[PDB]
Amino acid sequence: PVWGHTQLNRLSFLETVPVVPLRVSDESSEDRPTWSLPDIENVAITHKKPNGLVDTLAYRSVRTCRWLFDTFSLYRFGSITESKVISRCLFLETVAGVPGMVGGMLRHLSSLRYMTRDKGWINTLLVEAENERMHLMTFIELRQPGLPLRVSIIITQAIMYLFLLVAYVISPRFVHRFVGYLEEEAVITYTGVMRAIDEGRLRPTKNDVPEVARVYWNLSKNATFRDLINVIRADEAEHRVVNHTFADMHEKRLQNSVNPFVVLKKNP
Amino acid sequence: VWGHTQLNRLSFLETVPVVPLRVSDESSEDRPTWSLPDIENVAITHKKPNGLVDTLAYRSVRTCRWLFDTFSLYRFGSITESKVISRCLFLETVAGVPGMVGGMLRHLSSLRYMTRDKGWINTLLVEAENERMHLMTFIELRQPGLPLRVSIIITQAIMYLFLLVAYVISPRFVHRFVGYLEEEAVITYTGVMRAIDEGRLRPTKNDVPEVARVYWNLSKNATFRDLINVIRADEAEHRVVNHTFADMHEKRLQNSVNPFVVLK
């Protein structure tokens, strides 16, 4: 009835674009996170011992990138203002939206050419990628950036896309581990920011939550900036365990097993 | 129960032995929901090319068909079950590609220019999945020969390369080209449903694989012909969507809201 053969038999729906509204719900898929704030309050900073050369290489290269990025963004010294927080994450989530989508595509492409079951990996990686891009859609609202950032963002994609693509082919283990350790840093950053709100070292003006954040994370009009950070950090901690899991699975030759996290959205 | 205690765990490697293989988990939960006697009336459309690009897309699709019909010996012998399934195997390995690359490219845009996408990415992503679900379904009716596996692997290399540069140069062209591919998908499968009804093709695999049954939500008594019917409706959705998207590009509406987010 709603979507059926008369609509399926139409050449184009170009005529309808003017009369369809812009809703903030349609910006993501319907696979939204659903956290409970006083629970996720207790998300904590973890660190996973690296096994071999690959994990060490992933860890050192994450650590060398934090440092570079700390020092070129003048961030390490000055006061922790709301402007250097938004503006740092802003840049960081342009890059964070990439690894999920290269891995997903590539798993998709082998599923097709070897004609084999993927068993839940692709969509987990595809929603990681959207989730990070939803973080971007949200920070964008809190603070539009300048031309310098806009330029670095664009060149950075080219370097990162190209790197991650060859990395994923040569060694998905390395990329899942590399992400794993990125998310350790992302959780460190965000718990720091929530600590600073609490100790009064940062009082934010942007103490609304933009509509895109409000529907996506299902927050109430009364939600503080700190609440926004809290859900975001939870999201990041999820990705932390999921990719450390996926890297472990690779290390143990389980790249073709069932993705465990498909289950861990069930109430047993 | 997905809370701060599981979020605080290093790894779930230890659980992979005890998590069951479920046929529901092969896809997203964004599944099609057709009503069989409705979609029975899906029909065969053709969209006038607007300009040179649409024409060039149209000619590419038509030269591929000819090539692929002649080297697959489709004319030669009878319309068998073997030779239908075996051709759709090959075609869905290529059909899972365009939507993944288009979606990935729109994702990369949204990230680097920091702009709203307004619902395109996920439409194109599930198209890709949907076609890959067609493949997971047909793989069960018939594992292909070693020569077909080989030809599929070389094909993905050319097609993935081709679509990547084409989408970058001209997403209008790729959307139109897909648009016209799906016209053939609908021609083909209507033709198959016809043969079943006229008795020229008496199918053996009258047992819809479990992947297909739960993906499309069909009854246990559903027939191979029912399967073709939903599959052909899926293909028709994509026909109008990518012809829509191609038109949108032609009119410089690439950054408008994806009309099908409403028509959901």
Ligand SMILES: CCCCCCCCO[C@@H]1O[C@H](CO)[C@@H](O)[C@H](O)[C@H]1O
């Ligand atoms: C391409 C430029 C290479 C410059 C060499 C410095 C590489 C990283 O530098 C090291 O990284 C750590 C990051 O956790 C810092 O905290 C250390 O203080 C620093 O020695």
Ligand SMILES: CCCCCCCCO[C@@H]1O[C@H](CO)[C@@H](O)[C@H](O)[C@H]1O
């Ligand atoms: C790379 C090799 C290309 C060979 C070019 C010859 C094209 C074959 O002749 C053809 O006639 C068909 C009639 O059924 C038409 O449908 C096609 O448009 C056309 O390709």
Ligand SMILES: [Fe+3]
């Ligand atoms: Fe992030």
Ligand SMILES: [Fe+3]
């Ligand atoms: Fe992240």
Ligand SMILES: [Fe+3]
């Ligand atoms: Fe198809």
Ligand SMILES: [Fe+3]
């Ligand atoms: Fe198709």
Ligand SMILES: [O-]
């Ligand atoms: O992040």
Ligand SMILES: [O-]
């Ligand atoms: O097809």
